[PDB]
Curated annotation (Swiss-Prot), chain B:
Name under which the protein is recorded: Chaperone protein caf1M
Disulfide bridges in this chain: 85-109
Intracellular or extracellular location(s): Periplasm
Organism per entry: Yersinia pestis
Gene Ontology CC annotation, any one: outer membrane-bounded periplasmic space
A Pfam family reported for this protein in Swiss-Prot or TrEMBL: PapD_C
From Swiss-Prot, chain C:
A Pfam match: Antig_Caf1
Keyword Secreted found: yes
Compartment list: Secreted, Capsule
Region spans: Contains potential antigenic determinants that may stimulate T-cells: 79-129
Key words, A-Z: Capsule, Plasmid, Secreted, Signal
SUPFAM superfamilies cross-referenced by the UniProt entry: Bacterial adhesins (SSF49401)
InterPro entries: Adhesion_dom_fimbrial_sf, Adhesion_dom_sf, Caf1
Organism in which the protein naturally occurs: Yersinia pestis
An annotated GO cellular component: extracellular region
GO BP terms, alphabetized: cell adhesion
Protein name: F1 capsule antigen
């Protein structure tokens, strides 16, 4: 019987700019989703977190001062066309056979100057029509 | 106006003791080429190798330096402190007046913190454990942890004090500006391993 | 129907050490009637920037080849080794005089936190202890070393 797996490969450390924000389109990490049924499409995949911001996964500082930044989740099909799974309910392509990489790409600070350090997000994926 | 600038990709290096090496990026932010001269100094201001020790970095370009530990012996119950200094060397270049011609060069220096794997946790886990006394006209921080407590903000009786690190399992004595008589609250924040200012702690002096 | 998994991941953000320096030349220096140069002339204005707030005046050290503690030394280019000295001073937020280290020592004021963003320092003439400065081109090559907190 089918079992969904979600693993992750951290990307490079992210540099905070002089103005306290981060650049866009940095590879923050790679999510690898596996175990879904043949034929599963991207609208059947929904990555969610606590912040629950539609379209974005939010990372939050561990220092109790609540700096955050947002990211988007985009993969690639074998034409190199973008695959946009739902993130907190909002984005349609067939996933690759067996498993699919999804790149977590930086957007920016949610507001204010970011303090260097570690930032976390606990992510859930729900895969429907299985 | 003459302009100079050197950027190192981190503000400190946490060097895991006995690791083969770490990479750090350097960036020439200027419009002319420079020579990048990189040197390590001990904690006193004067085993680790930086490769390359000298190389040309063109305008607006970035390259990586490798910092490698080749042998040497370090204590295992505390961090050790060295300094990596990255200097940007720019290109070189009336019968009655004194004409004055000055060239500069920036030597950007960052802490190289040698950290035994034997230590558990990280500095932000212990930042609250600093304690404070006033003695011989100075404010004294005692750091019982095995980490350098790299203070980035310090305030005593509501007045800023220029920060400095507190060495592991030891102390540091800060000079007091005038008019601090009967002051009680010390608030501080350390700088974390990634260079960010950590959360604020407060206590009264003994 | 639905299947799920979850994981909690970490991103690392770093603050680099950026340092800049702008030097704005002062006016040319006139030799006076008795052959001295005037003291406290604005030789030039240095603006140090890029550093993180909390960076201190004792963490900044301007050095040169002459290595005279507290002074930068300018030397003729004519073979005669005529010299004068200058000091490097600025103002803190209360408008008190401060100085970075110059060749390893502070001429004036306590250790202070540098102004947020950038800090101006002024190179000001002192004099020549030799006397008798010739007209000409005088140089120094100065390293600014910033020891990041």
């Amino acid at each position: 019987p089918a079992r969904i797996t979600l693993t992750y490969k951290e990307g490079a450390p992210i540099t905070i700019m002089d103005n306290g924000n981060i650049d866009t389109e940095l590879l923050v990490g790679t999510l690898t989703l596996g175990g879904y049924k043949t034929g599963t499409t991207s609208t059947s995949v929904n990555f969610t977190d606590a912040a629950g911001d539609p379209m974005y996964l939010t990372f939050t500082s561990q220092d109790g001062n609540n700096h955050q930044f947002t990211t988007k989740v985009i993969g690639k099909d074998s034409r190199d066309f973008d695959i946009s799974p739902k993130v907190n309910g909002e984005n349609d392509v067939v996933l690759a056979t067996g498993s699919q990489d999804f790149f977590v790409r930086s957007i920016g600070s949610k507001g204010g100057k970011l303090a260097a350090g570690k930032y976390t997000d606990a992510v859930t994926v729900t895969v429907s029509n299985q | 106006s003459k302009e100079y600038g050197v950027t190192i990709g981190e503000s400190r290096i946490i060097y895991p003791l006995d690791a083969a090496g770490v990479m750090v990026s350097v960036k020439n932010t200027q419009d002319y080429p420079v020579l990048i001269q990189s040197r390590i100094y001990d904690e006193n201001k004067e085993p680790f190798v930086v490769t390359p020790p000298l190389f040309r970095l063109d305008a607006k370009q970035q390259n990586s330096l490798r910092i490698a530990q080749a042998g040497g012996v370090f204590p295992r119950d505390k961090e050790s402190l060295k300094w990596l200094c990255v200097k940007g060397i720019p290109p070189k270049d009336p019968d009655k007046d004194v004409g004055v011609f000055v060239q500069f060069a920036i030597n950007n220096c960052i802490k190289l913190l040698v950290r035994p794997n034997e230590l558990k946790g990280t500095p932000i886990q212990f930042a609250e454990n600093l304690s404070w006394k006033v003695d011989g006209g100075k404010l004294i921080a005692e750091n019982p942890s095995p980490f350098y407590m790299n203070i980035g903000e310090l305030t005593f009786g509501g007045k800023s004090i220029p920060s400095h690190y507190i060495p592991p399992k030891s102390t540091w004595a800060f000079d007091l500006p005038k008019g601090l008589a009967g002051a009680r609250n010390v608030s501080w924040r350390i700088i974390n391993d990634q260079g960010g200012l950590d959360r604020l702690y407060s206590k009264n002096v003994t």
